[PDB]
Design a protein around this ligand. Structure first.
Ligand SMILES: C[C@H](CCC(=O)O)[C@H]1CC[C@H]2[C@@H]3[C@H](O)C[C@@H]4C[C@H](O)CC[C@]4(C)[C@H]3C[C@H](O)[C@]12C
Ligand SMILES: C[C@H](CCC(=O)O)[C@H]1CC[C@H]2[C@@H]3[C@H](O)C[C@@H]4C[C@H](O)CC[C@]4(C)[C@H]3C[C@H](O)[C@]12C
Ligand SMILES: C[C@H](CCC(=O)O)[C@H]1CC[C@H]2[C@@H]3[C@H](O)C[C@@H]4C[C@H](O)CC[C@]4(C)[C@H]3C[C@H](O)[C@]12C
Ligand SMILES: C[C@H](CCC(=O)O)[C@H]1CC[C@H]2[C@@H]3[C@H](O)C[C@@H]4C[C@H](O)CC[C@]4(C)[C@H]3C[C@H](O)[C@]12C
Ligand SMILES: C[C@H](CCC(=O)O)[C@H]1CC[C@H]2[C@@H]3[C@H](O)C[C@@H]4C[C@H](O)CC[C@]4(C)[C@H]3C[C@H](O)[C@]12C
Ligand SMILES: C[C@H](CCC(=O)O)[C@H]1CC[C@H]2[C@@H]3[C@H](O)C[C@@H]4C[C@H](O)CC[C@]4(C)[C@H]3C[C@H](O)[C@]12C
Ligand code: FES
Ligand code: FES
Lengths: 359, 359
């Protein structure tokens, strides 16, 4: 009955209520792995306070908070139930949520796992495609926790640091895309253009060698092959903020561009998220699909449902862990190679932390 | 006996001798599809002249000329030999080379195809990954040829505008990668880091929605899957020129970056080319693998052999054409969707030229 194998589900997380917004932003602006700011300890809390109002408003517009925890929990539960049957030898299994900027924090999760006296610990990022700013930071967090708690782990660690083309993940996306195409007016099904939308990155991060763009592109190709290229598409990027150069084309500008050129039936696909979040419920659904779409005279714009509670996604999670345990993988081969132009000394240390694990 | 089906092999081409360098550049700077310059008719010849000496020197350093035509010819021959046996209904088959900036020019080829009284004409781009500046411009040249010659085609046209993941193309790359790995000292085989190198694009082109990046990424993923992720990798871009922002990371900077970070065994892979060219024999082999490599302290840097005369590549070409004929494809579904921010009015017209083709 005592938990044996723990599955740490890593994700950035999102504020559950409006009151959680400020601290969310604060923890984020204090993360060196994500950004280096002048007098950061002073500006971090300041920027957080000045952005809180506007960000609280965005969450109010979607109902008052982020559903990430809810969806993550349901996905974890399904995953566990399947693992206890798939791998009796490693059962019982228990999932732990390790959010990067909100409770339960990555550090609180690890602390709970250590107290539960697990034998095996698996860092399972929830970002199918790897980015040093997301999965990397989350993995860095695990290494720093021990390096700071002044004591070696009491569990055997390993990590599933990426999984951009897992067949069940691809199937989930393909299934959701198809059912959504069925929602368009019959007369426009074939005319529908698919815009796969992933989170954009500043060009400064892309240019240092971030793995993200290339992996996201792989997921896209995999999904389209499964769809037998029934509709034309383009991979675009959303969430750019600030005046600096980011990887484009931008999702909003692409939507507007398509309309001005006669392609008024668009299908958006949140290809790099596993559940609804502010990026889908507000940015894509309200900001672009309601406001922008109107001004551009779109005829039909829809978004494929987020993976959320699809039972197939949980199976995907279970299959990944199961196959990870069976192969004795400590981490992907990809993690053993840091960005050619990486300037963060912790990246190499985090890699070694995992590649060096006993077992 | 007389040719029935003609396969137009499209490629930019390269100057065969140092003397061909000037006109090569001249034709290129005069292509509106590739770039728009102020007083272009006056500047094109001027720029061509000022770059000629440096570019001629580059070709001198690799032996005095570009091997693109020789390799294209051999590949076309193998393709035809196979098609005459694979698709008897469409035989005899004949291949025609349509270089965009050197003889035989795309226009000269079409002219010859007409004169041969072919029944079927297939525009077969030799760029597996689609870019509006390469395949797009080449397809644009075909539409413009008829629109300016004031006459409708006398052959039924169609196009294989892309093939980033054809399984035989993938095996060819995977095969050349493996045998190149066998050339590294055994002790360092597993330490080898793979740098897939593709031609970079200016961000202005990337941001308007160019299909290139995403498709190149697909080829990389497929190849790595076939290699079962034996070595870690990163997709980088070469050939940036000028001071404007281009899509990185840059191949030269990545090589240098890897070295100063302790990864001194590098394998370069020209993932977006089908034969050797100045980009491989000079840029990668001399500029990077000899000069840059020396100054950086590399232990071992090699480059997977270009597809060139590999019989499997010819097979790939033949099967692509075969399947294309069997399915009645006029063009890919992707060609029916122009870039969201396309500003070239001819792109839409070229697309219609193919989608509206009789039969
Ligand atoms: C200089 C630094 C960016 C450094 C870099 O990576 O080049 C930027 C990032 C966020 C900026 C701050 C945020 O925009 C918040 C404030 C905005 C005000 O207009 C100036 C002060 C202000 C406090 C800015 C100071 C400075 O320009 C910051 C700190
Ligand atoms: C740009 C960066 C990712 C960089 C990278 O991948 O290298 C992402 C990670 C988390 C993001 C931030 C978080 O989502 C929190 C804020 C969300 C707001 O909608 C925009 C500002 C906001 C402050 C975001 C700015 C930017 O998009 C961040 C900082
Ligand atoms: C827009 C916001 C400041 C808002 C404000 O002044 O109220 C600032 C604060 C910190 C900034 C980020 C950090 O400077 C880190 C990154 C710096 C890059 O040059 C752009 C992306 C980058 C991710 C920035 C995006 C954006 O401009 C941020 C998120
Ligand atoms: C202005 C234009 C780029 C416009 C654009 O992309 O927005 C650039 C493209 C190529 C440039 C030219 C080429 O670099 C060749 C010449 C270089 C000299 O240093 C200036 C004149 C010169 C003749 C340049 C004039 C101008 O800056 C040009 C014509
Ligand atoms: C940048 C452009 C592709 C743009 C795009 O994909 O949109 C490519 C296509 C052909 C290229 C040019 C041709 O290769 C001819 C020249 C080759 C030299 O090594 C650099 C200058 C040179 C003049 C190249 C400049 C640039 O890289 C070009 C113009
Ligand atoms: C470098 C070369 C001029 C060389 C010279 O004057 O000696 C110039 C001439 C035309 C330029 C190109 C054209 O301006 C078209 C493109 C403009 C984009 O802003 C950069 C890429 C882009 C493809 C340019 C690359 C490069 O700067 C070129 C090729
Ligand atoms: S920034 Fe990518 S490994 Fe360090
Ligand atoms: S520039 Fe891409 S279709 Fe016109």
């Amino acid at each position: 009955r005592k938990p044996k194998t723990g599955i740490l589900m890593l994700n950035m997380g999102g504020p559950e209520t409006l009151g959680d917004v400020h601290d969310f932003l604060l923890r984020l602006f204090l993360d060196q792995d994500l950004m280096t700011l002048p007098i950061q300890n002073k500006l971090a809390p300041f920027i957080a306070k000045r952005l809180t109002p506007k960000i609280q408003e965005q969450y109010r517009r979607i109902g008052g908070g982020s559903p990430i925890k809810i969806w993550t929990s349901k996905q974890g539960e399904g995953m566990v139930k399947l693992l206890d049957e798939l791998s009796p030898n490693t059962a019982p299994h228990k999932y732990y949520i390790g959010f990067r900027y909100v409770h339960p924090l990555t550090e609180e999760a690890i602390e709970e796992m250590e107290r539960d006296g697990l034998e095996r610990a698996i860092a399972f990022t929830q970002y199918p495609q790897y980015s040093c700013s997301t999965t990397g930071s989350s993995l860095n967090a695990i290494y720093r926790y021990y390096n700071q708690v002044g004591r070696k782990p009491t569990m055997k660690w390993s990590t599933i640091d990426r999984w951009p083309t897992h067949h069940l993940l691809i199937q989930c996306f393909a299934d959701h895309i198809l059912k959504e195409l069925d929602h368009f007016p019959l007369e426009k099904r074939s005319e529908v253009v698919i815009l796969f939308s992933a989170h954009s990155l500043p060009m400064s991060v892309v240019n240092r060698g971030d793995p993200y763009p290339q992996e996201v592109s792989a997921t896209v190709q995999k999904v389209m092959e499964r769809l037998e290229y029934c509709n034309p598409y383009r991979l675009v990027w959303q969430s750019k903020v600030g005046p600096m150069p980011w990887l484009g084309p931008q999702t909003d500008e692409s939507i507007k561009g398509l309309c001005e050129r006669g392609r008024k039936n668009i299908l958006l696909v949140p290809i790099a998220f596993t559940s609804d979040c502010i990026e889908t419920l507000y940015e894509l659904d309200i900001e672009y699909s309601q406001v922008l779409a109107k001004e551009c005279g779109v005829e039909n714009i829809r978004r494929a449902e987020s993976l959320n509670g699809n039972p197939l996604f949980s199976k995907a999670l279970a299959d990944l862990v199961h196959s990870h345990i069976q192969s004795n993988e400590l981490c992907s081969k990809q993690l053993t190679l840091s960005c050619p132009l990486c300037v963060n000394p912790v990246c190499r240390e985090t890699k070694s932390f995992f590649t060096s694990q006993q077992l």
